[PDB]
Assembly symmetry: C6
Homo-oligomer: 211 residues x 6
């Protein structure tokens, strides 16, 4: 029920999965608890609407169930353009994609931990080699440059309430016409922030559903 | 009831027809269904008005027939200017025309499919050779450069509701004074995204009528 | 009841008259009908007010009489400045005058026809030699460059309603102090869009009255 | 009841007087009537307030007296700055003064007449030699350059009503500390638009009082 | 009740005092009256509040008293920044300070007089040598350049009412850490608009109190 | 209950502590009283809301306790970016951090005292060498350049009421991935405005709690 080999989907999942494995330390009496930051893919307005819905105190079980919601990260595509350096598709087209990575947090410390886990890997760019194999052929080698373009710090108060920092990223990637899922599912690998060759998980696995 | 040989009409139809034959795959229980994206030519404000009129659930048969409406594409001319590099018409005038191609979709996946079918052919430009023959004379050969200028991503929510992406295109074309339909209808051919020589269909054939 | 030899008047009429003789083809049951596009000289705000007064369906004999109103063209001066390349007047002062030519239309087709009759003659400029003779002396030869600067496309809806495209033109002309109508009326000729030497008609002849 | 030798006052009057002597022809049956355009010096907002006060139909004795009010010209200073090319005053300081000259008119024809009498003398500048004599000493020779910087066209409707064109002028003049009226009144002459050496009239003669 | 040796205070007082001694001539029947223009140091908003408070007619004794309030001058610091050309304080730090000098007046004539007394001494700059002596040591010589940056003309009406012209000045001065008033009071002299060496009056002497 | 070795935290504390020790002189009859200006770390809006909560005169016990609140300083991070001049962390990444230092005060004199204690040490930059030791290893030497970028002056009145000046600072520092507190606590020293090597106090000591 979705175009699996979509190039946009692959870039969405790649970006999401780079930021999928981020935890914050939270000290308890019995001991330190490390919690994973759940990440979604959605238009920002959408996400924020639904976030205002979850954070709403309707009953007594909600009062507690409120601090499990934050911290979280929302991801979205916001712009793209041709990337000015016989047919077209591997050899493919140099495209350039703009992503907003929106971190939301109830505690400045939460934010500090998270961003400290992101920010140092972009100087200002972070390279990743991606391998996309078609059926059983030799995989393709796509050089992917991800550039940290800018950051944006903001709040939204009520008495605490909610800290929001947004990073903007430029992916220098590759576009080509759709290759039907029926012609075979694309196998994809990439190098993470430590040059560790992870293989790209299916979409359904990286993003929690806002729905 | 229209000036058939209109230069503007030909550019509207040319653009519309390049993007006329775009389908999205939609996986069903019985098997995959492929649906064509219907295309219109209209002022954007107009299109959106009539679209809000259609999207309104008036009766029970409308509730279903709503997701037959989307996806669609609306096309319009939004600007033109002289294209700065004895009488006038073949030799004609280098003109430059600005088109807004507006894709509306209920599902991110629909969008991904469509745009993946448009975007790779503009690097940033796409050439097409056009042949316009007058009655039975030797056809004229007009070199047409179409350049992808920018993209713009947006929403418009209600609880799903509607994704809207707009591509802006610069057509580098040719203008000349009207040649009366009474002097004979122009025969028009062109090269598609695959250098395949289709001949330009009548207006009534490419655009579904917003009316 | 007006300064006949007014320099501004002469430019208003020249511009008005270049665009005075434009017809659109309108296919009927009995056969093709050609209708002339009527031109007025007025502040834009004004013109649109009176146009909203005329187009308002107050009654039934109006219901029909509404589609005789459109299409039309309103012309106006909007800016002027010294034209940086013993006393003053022939030898006169190089002035530069800015005109807004506003085309209004109920049908996209009407617009296409009209503008296709304007646009090809400005690449980006259109020359005209003007001859202004004083009484019976040797006429003066003023070289007039008219440059197409920009175009602007708009609507204004109600259920159709009205298409509005405005061209902006830079006339590079000549200014001098007023020469009394009592010293004799100035004779003026010019070369039209086909270099055919028409002579400049009186104001009352070119523009229908907005009043 | 005012500092007669005021430098600001002198420039205000020079400007007003260059534009003091302007008439429009107004054709009647009995014969042509020439009317002088009255000029005032006032903040623009002020002038317009009082002008809305005069033009209001309070009675029938007012109804006639309305078309004697327009046309008029309001003049005002709107900016000044040092003019970047032992003590201070002749030798004096190069200053630069900015004037808004505002023409108001009930008929486009009136405007054409007036502005046609102003505009050709500024190409883009108009020089005037000014002679300022102290008591009986040798007059000082101040070269004054007046530059037409821009023009601005506007209306203000009610059913006719009122045309407003504003010229902006850069006077390149001279400033020095105040020379008391008790030390003797300054004698001032200048060259008009025709190099005719008029001598600068007292303020009260050039400007009608808005008060 | 204040840090007497404050560097900011010294610059505020220096500026205030250059403009402390400005009079306007006011011709009366009995004879000419010269009135000194009172100067305050305050935030512009503040000053205007209190000015509206003073100018308000609450009783009958106010009616007369009210027309003595204008003219006046309000002064304030509005910006400062480092002034780009072993420890720090004489040798001290080149700072640059921005002052708004705001002249308010009921009569154009009053304004003309005042400004004619300010404006000619800035071409565009006015130099002044300042001497700050510590206890009994050799005085320090600080070169102070004051530059006239821009001017701004405005009104505020009611039936007269009030003219407001503002000069903006860049003082190129010197900052250093605070030298306690207990370590001895700094003695300060400077050169006025005529290179005449006045010594800096205490704050309380230059500015009338807005409080 | 916070990531002690957080880099953002260290820079917040470094900045806060350079400005931790600022006093103003306040003359009493019994003798001069020196009061330390308290510093907080908070988003500006937050600080201002809570400041409006403290400044509200609710009772008589409140009326006195009003002038103990001011003066104060609020500090916050507002922007950051890569600082464009085998793995990453000491060797670490050149980052650039933007801080808004907001000084609030009831008296101009208070402001003058404070800012005079800040401003002279930034010409436009101030260097500090920081030593960060991990457990017991050899310290790291991070060169920290703090640049004064701009200042901004404002009020907020009610009859006095409150002066607000804001300095903006560019810290040219260093980022690296989080080093767990469990791996040992970081020891930090730095050179203050006088090259005095103080050691960085814990967060809890520098900032008063806004909560």
């Amino acid at each position: 029920g979705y175009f699996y080999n979509s190039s946009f989907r692959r870039y969405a999942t790649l970006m999401g999965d780079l930021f999928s494995n981020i935890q914050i330390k939270r000290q308890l009496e019995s001991g330190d608890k490390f919690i994973r930051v759940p990440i979604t893919y959605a238009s920002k307005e959408h996400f924020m609407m639904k976030l205002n819905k979850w954070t709403s105190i309707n009953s007594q079980e909600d009062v507690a169930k409120v601090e499990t919601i934050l911290p979280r990260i929302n991801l979205h595509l916001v712009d793209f353009s041709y990337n000015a350096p016989v047919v077209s598709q591997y050899n493919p087209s140099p495209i350039k994609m703009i992503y907003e990575l929106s971190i939301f947090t109830r505690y400045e410390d939460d934010m500090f931990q998270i961003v400290e886990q992101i920010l140092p890997y972009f100087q200002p760019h972070f390279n990743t080699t991606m391998y996309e194999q078609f059926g059983n052929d030799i995989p393709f080698k796509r050089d992917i440059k991800i550039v940290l373009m800018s950051a944006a710090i903001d709040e939204a108060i009520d008495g605490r309430r909610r800290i929001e920092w947004s990073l903007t990223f430029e992916v220098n990637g590759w576009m080509y016409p759709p290759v039907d899922d029926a012609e075979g599912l694309i196998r994809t690998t990439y190098t993470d922030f430590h040059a560790n060759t992870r293989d790209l998980p299916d979409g359904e696995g990286v993003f929690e559903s806002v729905d």
